[PDB]
Ligand binder design. Sequence first.
Ligand SMILES: [Ca+2]
Ligand SMILES: [Ca+2]
Ligand SMILES: [Ca+2]
Ligand SMILES: [Ca+2]
Ligand SMILES: [Ca+2]
Ligand SMILES: [Ca+2]
Length: 1340
Amino acid sequence: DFQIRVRVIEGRQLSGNNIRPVVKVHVCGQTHRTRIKRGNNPFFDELFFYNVNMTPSELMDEIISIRVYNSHSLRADCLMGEFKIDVGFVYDEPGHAVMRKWLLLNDPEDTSSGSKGYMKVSMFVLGTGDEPPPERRDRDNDSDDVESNLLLPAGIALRWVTFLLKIYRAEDIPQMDDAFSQTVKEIDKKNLVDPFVEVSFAGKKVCTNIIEKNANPEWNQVVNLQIKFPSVCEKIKLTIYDWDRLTKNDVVGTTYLHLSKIAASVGFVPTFGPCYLNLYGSPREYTGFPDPYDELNTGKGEGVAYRGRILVELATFLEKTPPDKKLEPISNDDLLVVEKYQRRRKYSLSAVFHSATMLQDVGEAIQFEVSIGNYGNRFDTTCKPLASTTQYSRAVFDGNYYYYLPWAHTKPVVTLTSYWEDISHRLDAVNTLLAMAERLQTNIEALKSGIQGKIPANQLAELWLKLIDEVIEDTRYTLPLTEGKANVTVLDTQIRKLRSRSLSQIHEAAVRMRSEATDVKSTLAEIEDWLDKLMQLTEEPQNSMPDIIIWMIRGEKRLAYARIPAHQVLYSTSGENASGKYCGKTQTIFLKYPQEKNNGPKVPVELRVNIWLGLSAVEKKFNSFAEGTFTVFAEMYENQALMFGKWGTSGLVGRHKFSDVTGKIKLKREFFLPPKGWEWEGEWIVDPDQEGWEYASLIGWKFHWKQRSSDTFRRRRWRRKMAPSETHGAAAIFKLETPIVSCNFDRVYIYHLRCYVYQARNLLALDKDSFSDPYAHICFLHRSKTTEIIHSTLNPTWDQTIIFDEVEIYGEPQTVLQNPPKVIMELFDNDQVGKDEFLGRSIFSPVVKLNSEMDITPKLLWHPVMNGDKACGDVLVTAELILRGKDGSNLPILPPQRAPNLYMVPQGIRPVVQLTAIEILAWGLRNMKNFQMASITSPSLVVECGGERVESVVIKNLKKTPNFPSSVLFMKVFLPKEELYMPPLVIKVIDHRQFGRKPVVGQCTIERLDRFREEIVDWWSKFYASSGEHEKCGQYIQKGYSKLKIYNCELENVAEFEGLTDFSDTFKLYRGKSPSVVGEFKGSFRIYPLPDDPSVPAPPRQFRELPDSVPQECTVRIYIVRGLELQPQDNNGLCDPYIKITLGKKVIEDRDHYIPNTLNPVFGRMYELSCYLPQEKDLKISVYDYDTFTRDEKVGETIIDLENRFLSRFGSHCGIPEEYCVSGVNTWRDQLRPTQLLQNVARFKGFPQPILSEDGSRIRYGGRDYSLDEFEANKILHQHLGAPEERLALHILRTQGLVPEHVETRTLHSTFQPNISQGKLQMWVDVFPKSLGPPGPPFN
Ligand SMILES: [Ca+2]
Ligand SMILES: [Ca+2]
Ligand SMILES: [Ca+2]
Ligand SMILES: [Ca+2]
Ligand SMILES: [Ca+2]
Ligand SMILES: [Ca+2]
């Protein structure tokens, strides 16, 4: 057996606009398909498996078709085409795998003009039982470096285009040298780097000229690339290196030149610029030891510090094909036209720090630093040093687990002045369509909560009208006037034309949606990719504003970072929507460690900041955004010394009488005066010994509160406030060009928060017993609490409300209503020995309720619990964050207490549970796989549903008796009525192996728990009589014989007998961690409501008629009638078919009764076997092909599971006749008489026993009375008829649904086509247990 593995990963630049791509995968005739995605660039990560049993000389002949289609709402999928490749190519590859290779899409004739898309494809062909070399991860480093399958027939792309990438200059490049060559002259440190740009695209690398010792270089060069005009590679890797002779060239930073943000399928050649592109990487401070964060320099990771920026412009000639003229200087007219794109404007930044919580370290002082680009870097040397950093703060303990900062009403303020290009003509568009995208996403989630919650139809209709009218209103946003702005690029005009086209298209289709349709459920498919169209309109290659990187410094060591993209904080005069989302508004920001892509086990700090950025020509209107009152304190001091036992101001050598805090620099009260926009407030007062004297042991040393024995020097304090005087206002803090500025809040607001932590699911097992002991640290700003520990559970139910009182948060309540701070839950595994282990983190926002009219009861939601990178479980939590009014009167009623100071989740927020009886018919396990290459001998079954546990009796010998002695199990579980909150059912299988081990050899998951609430009078004559094929009314039919029924499909496909699976519903098991087939457990579940009183015992069982559950030896008799339309297997164009049967240890090969040269073989043959049931349940019937000289080919095969035939409630073990007869061809072969079968089916159906009459003429059964004269009226009777009671009871058995005699017609399947009809044939099978005695006479 050979195996084909196919994986689809990604699609990029698929042709056509407004497309909904989907991929159909076909391997060797077996065809499936993927899901439907949105947009131009879908991501799939779908995997499919296939198996064929071809010869090794025939395996390479088949092809792999990965054909792609364009899905439509009202039409069928339209073919796009694909480059199919044979199996010989992937088998010819080293390792037998073309692995993560790209693939082309093609029109079969129009592929010469360009490809129709690209699809990332993984191939592997290997034998069965083998394993692959490992594959994982998502990355974009390998693209278009001949990874795409080249030389497809007549479909090579246009490799004639030349990328005219002009590079102009660069600025602010950080120091990448040790500066030893310059500091020996004792002097210039900011300009020592040797930048060159390694351009890289599709595996082609050209290096530009070197400029030595210039952090503001001027290249003015043209670099030429020769690529295909359709190219899968999305971005050019612009990576500035530092050139060095004695060592490998270090990496300054990496930015990317994205093309498909401009492209339309209407479209043009790739263009860009002239626009600056910002680099990011390691912190700018050079170290003599090699840099630990050098991985972030090469683009791996998002970068933690700004590393300069570079002005480039991309043009494209469809000509010039340059082999050797790869580097030419820029002509001078492009040099004076590029000065219009370098025009600087002054910018102003202010950051008010609101909170900095969830700290774990308490040792040594903390601070923060706000820097944009190079401005604000506290380690860079510059004249007039900026107030770019907050003051030092010492964290205090919140009482329970974490630490917070004592900032309280006095918030730190960081103010700095920068110089950037006025690219606000672009970022106005970026911010406005991002506001469109966020409004559309919020309204989409409103529609999603409407359709999931089943709101009334008028509410859903007015919500959808609000959606459509929102797009109607603000899609009329005119793009900014790109004339008179000197920095407008050619890409700006092309992108503006494309955006106007797309915006007018979605606008007119929004009028169409408003005027043609009312179907709110069909139109959301087009809204959901209108949202993706807005995503494709927002994002930019030309963002030259560097990110506001806001750091955390522990002493002098940089510890944690974040970066805000500066477009959502930039202010502009064009409008509020054209301004940023977080412009002048608070935001919750989780800082990360530098090497961490996302925060892992420990968040360093939950920093909350309010950053405003904008042009300094329009910084006058800070006063609309401003909150509180900005305040600066002027400083001077006075030193005294204890000489001759008395304090005095004289004798201060090295200091002054009036001076600064260290005493070294002389100061006076009027040395610093309030500048323009400022006036003095109040008067110089002592700010505290109650006199204010602070004493130290040495001169200019650390002062403290009171004079000890060793203190011989002292000082004291005076401060004077300065406040904004005129209507210059709070904007005057930019005019302080530095004294420490802080924002004073004159009003405090009280907040009361309740977190409803009900339950979790799918938590990791960090203990040795494959469970955990979870608990949660619920932290919110300057408070935290700890929940209870639920021991030995991976699906815990804490059922606990965590309550915080007196959480003081400043600012207006509308500020916290628009931007609530995050409630963070840190789940841990409680270990009684050692430190607890990190389980995960859930971040969600509380529903802020400022007053009584916002009293929405908060629904619990399954917020993800991220650990590392991936989600590792969910928690069902919510929160509410309320204005605490006067005396807490508007606060809700407290939740009840099951324990002292330990609250429960209250009645309206908890999942509404009702008590159910989950009854499990745990019967048997079939088709086991070896655990660690060792057979299974002693399995047992454990049923779990939301933490409730029941166990079954362990099987002593699986090979001998694979059936549980405990057939019926009970669980009494409070299950939620809502489908969302209701937990999945998990089954465990435990094998009694050596060493007293408890291993899991199989696990099962179930989610659809809503389900379980004259002639010779032979058989050829009777077959023709029932079929009506021959004579159709004749004298044989006029003898009144029993008539069978011919079914053209399977009995399993007959919905009348429920597929013969009702008593034995089959399920699917798994093993290990990412998997494949290990086993199958079957047995019917019955999940029905228990009575509402928990003390009341069980209701009567739904499983009350357990049969003989031990295995029984059974005699089988297989009848084969005729095959139809078989596939030829010979050189003569026909087939010579025969029968091959295997029942476990017994094999029958029906060789010498073959039928020559037919495709319709009338077999008419009788095969008798006897085998152990239900162990050998797999009855395999196959048709093979006679050849007198060659190997027998396989025509087809079908699998019949006889235990489902024997154990069915419909009794398909023996096909009953129409009327009861004792001799001839109609002889009763069943070992149980019709009346005993009637009482048996009364037992299995739960029906009462049949009340026979005194002569058998009347039988009462199943709530209905039956009579013999109803069937015997105008019915011909003949001499084989037996007793009248059995005769009548047989007609009851025929009218009640017990299976009569049939000739079924099964489907053949080959190994090449396991689901396609490889012919047809007719069978009917008889099963008789030997426990009920010997069966009747066999039939010919
Ligand atoms: Ca270097
Ligand atoms: Ca260098
Ligand atoms: Ca543990
Ligand atoms: Ca533990
Ligand atoms: Ca043959
Ligand atoms: Ca043959």
